[PDB]
Ligand binder design. Structure first.
Ligand code: CA
Ligand code: CU
Length: 180
């Protein structure tokens, strides 16, 4: 159990994280998140996106009944966090730092449609960042240095934490705003 955070080093909090914790700097929160707002660490879903795992339209919730509210997708629905292309650091905070297979990060395609539910077709399925977990426990907070591709405007990053000793992964979408 854990979530994408910006407590020590991260560039942008997960969408679910902002249902509970105020955004760095602005204090913005996401609203009307349903029950997941009390446990942003619990967006747990089946392994194997995009081959298996959460189906289209259920990616942001990872098919969790707790997090169903996160599957809404419009241009204005969610708090967007500023980002730039190039080197950036993403951060996970774990309430339970399970043995880890890897972390993978995907970004939406340049001309994705922010006004329809998220789907495999919205994302570049070639992950822009992969971090090996080596089937060991990570520390309770980790920072991953990634190269973020060039984009304009509103984009979504999908961060996947694959727990190595269960058939489950944690799925945190991130709402980011590039210049332009
Ligand atoms: Ca797993
Ligand atoms: Cu857990």
């Amino acid at each position: 159990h854990g979530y994408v955070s910006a407590v020590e080093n991260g560039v942008a909090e997960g969408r679910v994280t902002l249902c509970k914790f105020a955004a760095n700097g602005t204090g913005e929160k996401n609203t009307h998140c349903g029950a997941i707002q009390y446990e942003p660490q619990s967006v747990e879903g089946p392994d194997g996106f995009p081959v298996t795992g959460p189906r289209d339209g259920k990616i942001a919730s990872a098919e969790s009944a707790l997090a169903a509210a996160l599957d809404e997708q419009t241009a204005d629905r969610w708090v967007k966090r500023p980002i730039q292309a190039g080197p950036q650091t993403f951060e996970w905070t774990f309430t339970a730092n399970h043995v880890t297979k890897d972390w993978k990060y995907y970004i939406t395609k340049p001309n994705w449609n922010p006004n329809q539910p998220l789907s495999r077709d919205a994302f570049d399925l070639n992950p822009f960042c992969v971090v090996e977990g080596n089937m060991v426990q990570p520390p309770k907070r980790v920072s991953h240095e990634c190269i973020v591709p060039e984009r304009e405007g509103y984009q979504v990053i999908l961060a996947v934490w694959d727990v190595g000793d269960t058939a489950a992964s944690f799925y945190n979408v991130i709402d980011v705003k590039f210049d332009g």
